[PDB]
């Protein structure tokens, strides 16, 4: 406790060094900044002194700074002598008090000479005992390494803020002190209630890089992987409590992209635990793993190709048997769980379309994976038997049209039969390779595409992009009747095939351009000028169709534009 | 943006990063032979128990009995523990100080045998204290499990054992074949299996992610420096074959064919061959990498570099594989005629003639060619 | 319900009403004469503000039956105490309290 | 393949020899060491392992072969192609049904047939003395234990009055004898050994308590014991089983719990099976009959499972605190 | 049989298609069969 | 009294009245957030008081002032004859 009362003191200290000397640097570093702009007509030297000091990286131009380690490079600072003493002044104190440099005369040698008169005059026998002095001495010997390793958890704050720290500390140490006790209602809820007051306060995303030294990220993964681990034999217990696990940790992702960096390390075990996490109604571990992914081509590309085969090996069993809540519950056996692969399918366009490039690497591992399992796309695009997406949709709308099937409802299977081929779809034009690579000739793009044509035809897409929608029809008494809009066919569903048709397939001659138009897309924006009418305004159908119209349909007719002429 | 519009506390953090980056990390500091020695000296306990002839173990005797002891504890599997590693660092150290040296003038036979007692009594400092049985406890207890704890008692074997000295050889066969531990052999197959190769797919993939830019979260630096994903676990492999050619240093044929086969052990593991396994394996990557790298005559920096630290494990392994057939053992000898020795260096005939040529055209590849001579010299 | 036992008699005039704190030395004892709270222990005055519901019913109709400096003795019945469930690992359910309540001040 | 259930005793059918090694095409016998049982053909079963009293020259009789060639054996290679010696047929796999195999039933049957199927030639690995000497005392404490539960299940229902009961008397003295080996077999290394050596035979003791766990001594030890509590008294058993049978109840009870004990001591497989046991334990605390020893299976369990103490109950917690009462 | 091991004879092979990347593959869906590039799998001995 | 019975005792105490403040605060020890505060910029590293041996002088372990935030410790009186009282957590 003495010792590590030194390191407080040495961090501390250190912090005081950082405040002091950053004021003397900033008002230093401005001055000469503007010194620099009132020097007119800069020459190559000025103009690379001047985007040395400003338009530059703050981490790069404070190493810049700091660069004057050495006395070879003290040359290239531009900081004055003056007040670069200061930081080797400050740099030889800590030494001296980090003790690089008879009767013991500081902590340090009373701790060494302690420990190695006692274990020379005796053979300790207590293990414990032993690992303690042991770990005196090596402390005593280097706590410069120990200032090494202490520095990472040292983060200054500003003194404004101090009473949003001390909730958030308060908060995190009822977190861990929760961590020794076996989980139960009256835990839970004191997690819950402290995950929330996290998420409230204003720090959490002030200063993203304060939680991901204090590691709270790690310690509600330690409680969640406890929670998963029990949850694992049977059903999951306190589905709540994983609720606020992702609740957090989704959003941690968010925050930051090296908090998200620092939560797709965990991706992992996201992944293994996505089986137990699905099914639940809350952010799940698959989600987890989704946010770990979203939006980062530099991780993207770190995503590995059994952590790929994971999620396509959970999509084929989905795919093999049927739900077995749905089958507690009462819902009609399908042997065909739709609802389970629907979220590995969404995580899987995560994991392929980022920033409007799918990237080439994880596509074709993608579609590697799903077609050394066919077992993946269900009872449709099957090898035998599997019908067709027309059959397969239009069956499932038979199948949500009568309440033999349909019911067993908070999940309607006759959606999710839709929900899940259009979620294959959209995975698989959203895997579909780029058009420079197609006009580059290459040759696992063009096996690619092949293979993606293969597996879905025109004739299938245009079929169900014409299927009839229903409209939210007016009838007695100005009762209009709103499509269900979760248990009925949304346009949503016709959207990713949109895509798939301008990916793969895309528009090439005139004549197939007006077969699509007046097959399933002028009946679609017929449609929506109609329900244009003020009633049917505000309507949920109408919103989502128009989201559909300009996200999908009408992209294309933009960028179809040139072949119209001659029509 | 200037430092001069950032608030106060960002700057104190960022000269928080900044100082521990450049100022205390690149200082460095020489404590562990201090230590080392004051551990290892036993104070005045020759004058305060001179009845006994035989005493209480040293400090440092201590230190290693207590390793000794948490590595033989029953358990499934190995933990992290900073203080076996900070330990195991400080005494690796202490006895290679010698072995490191801590246009020149040649060394004279005296300055050099001086120099070989200093690094024996260094290493005899810690081998008369069970040093050579706690790092095969290390590695049985690893049980093939790659990280921290491996990677510092394998650094910690080579420290031990730099000249292949004939003690700690003796003492590590004699732990060896007295507990009949197939756990330490098991544990150095798995070693070589999960030691990897030259990966073209983390190459092209790290190649698109180094010309991609990217932000980070605190300012914006245009590529996060991050460690090459390709012939990853480099330091550990190329350690991992030293300290196998260590220990079949000095033509001892006892460890020599010990390695091929344990007779004592009820199961034998053929070390040899695994080294051969992972040789070949090796040269089926490094014929991939020349293939891509073939229809594009000059080389990138990133490619140079890939197969410098690749022809560097390279290197390790053929030097290992020298150690096991330098002296005329037919038993090593014998089983490296029926392996697969021979498809291996076919390859790698024709991996060099390729690279020969290839590398002579492009004088910018002169290095990469030198030291490609280097490993067909091995 | 509660029945006071003078133990002490004090001034018997000012009387805790509604509205102040009131500053008391108990000793709560058992049902079964096995003592179970004091305060000379934590050597502390309880101090509770009357009326705010702060303490078990019984005690505090017992603490405004008494006046200044009037020592006396509170039996508190379950019905005025904790009752079906008791304090949990204090007092067991169902239980007569029996309090050597000491008035010392009022502010 | 730690198991007991995987050891096959080889002696060959010529007693002059039992003792050499066994050459290609000796007519040997095989044996399986914990069940003592022979491996056999029968006509109706196949392949399968009878009796020794069933067992014949004719059916038991198995040979190593060096090839499926139709017209010594060592560990490490010689991968023998086991054969029948009266028949021709040959110890083949018999293909399970799919369904079952995915299921898990990684066991095939074990037919003898001339399928010449290149596995079916078999690996020799002799076992180590431990696990010899622990399944033969399995199988000679199996037996004598079920010959107990026998013994002790014949006057059943049955007071056996006036003479004793008709059966054959129970092995008591042999059951007193074995119990106390195999606490003496099982007892736990002293402290005062060295880390070492404590270690080493700890791992020791945890495999064989583990082998006997699996082969079910466990479960058998558990029959005794239930066997023997329906009688609340020495008196009372001796009103079923004699009084001359009476004496050593007390002590065969003592001896049961503290084999018990030390079967499930430091083990955590074996602690964990006691989990449906928990309230076997609770609901026996309060037997006179060594009181002492049931309260140590339970403390064995509780300080080694944790499992057990997340089905801890509330009556549970009352036996214990009436244990104290 | 990993990858880069010699083909011995008799040992099953599966055969997949460079372009298509396909498994041949032994149909068996009519009372005929017919050999076909699929992305399921079938052994083949590779008998010299 | 008989030494197991104090060690008993001591042990007792802590453990009723000291355990969970004294947990939560190693807890906190692993990070040192420090605030930006006059009081932060005033402590030195050796002793401010004292100028060059004297300042090279090492101070006590503990006696400078830390600043550095830690949760402060909250407990609540031992009360058993209050109100009875989803509760919030009990206090040491």
């Known amino acids: 406790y003495f010792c590590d009362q030194e390191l407080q003191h040495r961090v501390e200290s250190l912090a005081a060094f950082a405040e002091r000397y950053v004021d003397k640097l900033q008002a230093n570093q401005r001055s000469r900044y503007a010194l620099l702009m009132r020097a007119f007509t800069m020459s190559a030297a000025e103009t690379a002194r001047r985007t040395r000091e400003f338009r530059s990286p703050p981490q790069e131009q404070i190493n810049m700074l700091l660069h004057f380690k050495d006395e070879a490079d003290e040359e290239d600072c531009p900081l004055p002598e003056d007040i670069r003493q200061d930081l080797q002044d400050f740099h030889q104190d800590l030494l001296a008090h980090c003790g690089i440099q008879k009767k013991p005369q500081s902590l340090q040698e009373l701790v060494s ?129 994983v609720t606020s696990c992702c609740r957090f940790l989704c959003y941690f992702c968010r925050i930051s992209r090296q908090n998200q960096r620092s939560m797709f390390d965990h991706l992992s075990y996201l992944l293994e635990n996505s089986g137990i996490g699905l099914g639940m109604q809350g952010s799940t571990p698959l989600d987890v793993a989704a946010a770990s992914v979203i939006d980062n081509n530099e991780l993207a590309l770190a995503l590995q190709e059994q952590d790929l085969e994971k999620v396509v090996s959970y999509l084929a069993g989905c795919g093999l048997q049927s739900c077995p809540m749905l089958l507690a519950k009462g819902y009609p056996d399908i042997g065909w769980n739709p609802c389970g692969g629907e979220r590995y399918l969404d995580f899987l366009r995560f994991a392929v379309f980022v920033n409007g490039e799918s990237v080439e690497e994880n596509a074709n591992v993608v579609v590697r994976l799903l077609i050394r399992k066919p077992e993946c796309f269900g009872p449709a695009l099957r090898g035998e038997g599997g019908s067709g997406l027309l059959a397969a949709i239009e069956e499932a709308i038979r199948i949500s049209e009568d309440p033999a099937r349909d019911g067993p409802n908070r999940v309607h299977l006759g959606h999710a039969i839709m929900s899940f081929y259009a979620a294959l779809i959209d995975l698989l034009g959203r895997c579909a390779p780029e058009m420079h690579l197609i006009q580059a000739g290459k040759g696992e793009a063009l096996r690619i595409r092949a293979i993606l044509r293969s597996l879905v035809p025109l004739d299938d897409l245009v079929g169900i992009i014409s299927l009839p929608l229903q409209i939210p029809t007016l009838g007695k008494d100005g009762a209009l009747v709103q499509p269900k809009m979760s248990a009925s066919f949304v346009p949503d569903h016709k959207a990713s095939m949109v895509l798939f048709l301008d990916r793969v397939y895309g528009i090439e001659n005139q004549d197939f351009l007006l077969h699509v138009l007046d097959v399933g897309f002028l009946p679609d924006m017929r449609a929506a000028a109609s329900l244009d009418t003020a009633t049917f305004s505000t309507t949920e159908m109408a919103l989502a169709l128009n989201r559909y119209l300009c996200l999908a349909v009408l992209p294309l007719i933009t960028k179809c534009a040139p072949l119209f002429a001659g029509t | 943006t200037p430092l001069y519009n950032l608030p106060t506390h960002r700057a104190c953090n960022m000269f928080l990063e900044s100082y521990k980056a450049a100022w205390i990390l690149t200082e460095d500091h020489s404590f562990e032979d201090r230590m080392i020695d004051d551990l290892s000296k036993a104070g005045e306990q020759e004058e305060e128990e001179e009845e006994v002839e035989e005493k209480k173990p040293d400090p440092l005797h201590q230190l290693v009995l207590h390793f000794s002891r948490t590595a ?288 002579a055209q492009d004088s910018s590849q002169i290095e990469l060619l030198k030291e490609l001579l280097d490993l067909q010299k091995d | 319900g509660v029945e006071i036992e003078t133990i002490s008699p004090g001034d018997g005039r000012t009387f805790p009403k509604k509205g102040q704190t009131c500053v008391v030395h108990y000793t709560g004892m058992l049902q079964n004469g096995k003592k179970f709270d004091s305060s000379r222990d934590r050597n502390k005055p309880f101090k509770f503000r009357i009326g705010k519901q702060e303490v078990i019913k019984g005690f505090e109709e017992g603490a405004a039956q008494m006046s200044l400096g009037q020592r006396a003795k509170l039996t508190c019945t379950p019905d005025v105490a904790y009752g079906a469930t008791g304090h949990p690992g204090v007092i067991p359910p169902n239980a007569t309290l029996i309090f050597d309540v000491e008035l010392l001040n009022l502010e | ?271 964990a099976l006691f989990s449906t046991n928990l309230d076997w334990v609770v609901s026996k605390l309060d037997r006179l009959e060594a009181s002492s020893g049931i309260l140590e299976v339970l403390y064995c369990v509780l300080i080694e499972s944790p499992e057990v103490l997340n089905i801890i109950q509330e009556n549970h917690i009352k036996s214990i605190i009436s244990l104290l009462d | 049989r990993s990858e880069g091991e010699k083909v011995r004879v008799g040992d099953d092979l599966i055969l997949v298609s460079v372009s298509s990347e396909r498994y041949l593959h032994l149909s068996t869906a009519s009372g005929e069969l017919q050999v076909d590039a699929s992305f399921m799998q079938t052994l083949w001995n590779m008998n010299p | 009294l008989p030494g197991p019975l104090r060690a008993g005792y001591y042990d007792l105490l802590i453990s009723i009245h000291l355990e969970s403040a004294c947990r939560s605060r190693r807890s906190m020890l692993s990070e040192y957030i420090v605030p930006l505060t006059p009081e932060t910029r005033a402590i030195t590293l050796f002793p401010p008081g004292r100028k060059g041996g004297n300042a090279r002088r090492h101070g006590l372990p503990g006696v400078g002032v830390t600043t550095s935030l830690r949760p402060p410790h909250h407990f609540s009186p031992p009360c058993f004859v209050a109100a009875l009282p989803e509760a919030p957590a009990r206090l040491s």
Request: proline content about 3%.
């Open chain 4, 1 to 271: 393949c730690t198991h007991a259930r995987s050891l096959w005793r080889l002696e060959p059918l010529r007693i002059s020899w039992s003792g050499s090694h066994l050459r290609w095409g000796q007519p040997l016998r095989i044996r399986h060491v914990t069940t003592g049982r022979y491996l056999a053909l029968t006509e109706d079963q196949g392949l399968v392992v009878v009796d020794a009293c069933k067992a014949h020259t004719k059916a038991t009789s198995f040979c190593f072969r060096v090839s499926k060639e139709k017209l010594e054996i060592k560990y490490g290679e010689s991968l023998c192609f086991v054969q029948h010696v009266a028949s021709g047929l040959w110890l083949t796999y018999a293909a399970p049904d799919p369904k079952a195999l995915r299921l898990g039933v990684l066991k095939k049957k074990a037919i003898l047939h001339q399928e010449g199927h290149m596995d079916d030639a078999l690996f020799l690995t002799r076992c180590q003395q431990e696990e010899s000497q622990a399944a033969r005392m399995i199988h000679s404490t199996a037996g004598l234990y079920n010959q107990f539960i026998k013994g002790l299940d014949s006057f059943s229902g049955k007071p056996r009055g006036s003479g004793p009961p008709a059966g054959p008397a129970l092995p008591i003295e042999a059951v007193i004898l074995s119990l106390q080996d195999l606490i003496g077999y099982f007892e736990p290394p002293s402290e005062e050994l060295q880390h070492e050596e404590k270690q080493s035979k700890l791992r020791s003791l945890r495999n064989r308590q583990s082998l006997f766990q699996e082969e079910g001594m466990l479960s058998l030890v558990l029959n005794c014991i239930d066997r023997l509590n329906v009688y609340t008294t020495a008196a009372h058993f001796a009103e079923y089983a004699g009084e001359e049978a009476a004496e050593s109840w007390k002590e065969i009870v003592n001896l049961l719990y503290e084999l018990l004990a030390s079967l499930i001591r430091g083990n955590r497989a074996n602690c």
């Open chain 1, 113 to 241: 000479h302690m420990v190695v008169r006692w274990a020379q005059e005796d053979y300790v026998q207590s293990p414990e005992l032993v690992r303690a002095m042991f770990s005196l001495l090596h402390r005593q010997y280097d706590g410069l390494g120990e200032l090494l390793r202490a520095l990472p958890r040292a983060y200054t704050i500003s003194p404004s803020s101090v009473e949003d720290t001390m909730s958030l500390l308060e908060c995190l140490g009822q977190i861990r002190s929760l961590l020794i006790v076996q989980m139960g209602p009256q835990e839970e809820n004191l997690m819950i209630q402290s995950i929330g007051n996290i998420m409230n306060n204003k720090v959490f995303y002030q200063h993203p890089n304060l939680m991901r030294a204090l590691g709270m990220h790690e310690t509600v993964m330690e409680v969640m992987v406890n929670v998963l681990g029990g949850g694992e034999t049977k059903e999951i217990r306190f589905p709540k409590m």
């Open chain 2, 72 to 359: 033989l504890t029953e358990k499934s599997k190995l933990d992290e523990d900073y203080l076996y590693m900070a330990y195991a660092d400080i005494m690796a150290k202490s006895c290679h100080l010698e072995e490191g040296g801590e246009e020149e003038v040649e060394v004279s036979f005296e300055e050099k045998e001086m120099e070989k007692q200093r690094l024996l009594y260094q290493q005899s400092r810690l081998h008369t204290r069970g040093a050579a049985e706690m790092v095969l406890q290390m590695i049985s207890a690893c049980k093939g499990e790659t990280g921290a704890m491996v990677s510092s008692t394998l650094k910690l074997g080579i420290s031990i054992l730099n000249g292949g000295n004939a003690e700690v050889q003796q003492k590590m066969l004699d732990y060896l074949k007295d507990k009949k531990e197939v756990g330490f052999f098991q544990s150095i197959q798995a070693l070589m299996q999960t030691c990897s190769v030259l990966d073209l797919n983390a190459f092209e993939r790290q190649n698109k992610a180094e010309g991609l830019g990217m932000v980070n979260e605190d300012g914006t630096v245009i590529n996060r420096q991050n460690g090459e994903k390709v012939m990853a676990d480099d330091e550990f492999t190329q350690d991992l074959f030293r300290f196998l050619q260590l220990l079949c240093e000095g033509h001892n044929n006892d460890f020599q064919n010990y390695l091929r086969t344990q007779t004592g052990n009820t199961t034998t593991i053929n070390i040899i061959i695994c080294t051969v396994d992972y040789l070949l394996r090796l040269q089926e990557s490094i014929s991939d990498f020349y293939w891509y790298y073939s229809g594009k005559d000059v080389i990138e920096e990133q490619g140079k570099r890939n197969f410098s630290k690749a022809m560097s494990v390279a290197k390790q392994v053929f030097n290992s594989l020298t150690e096991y057939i330098q002296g005329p053992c037919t038993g090593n000898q014998q089983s490296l005629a029926h392996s697969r020795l021979w498809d291996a260096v076919v390859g790698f005939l024709h991996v060099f003639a390729h690279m020969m040529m290839k590398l």
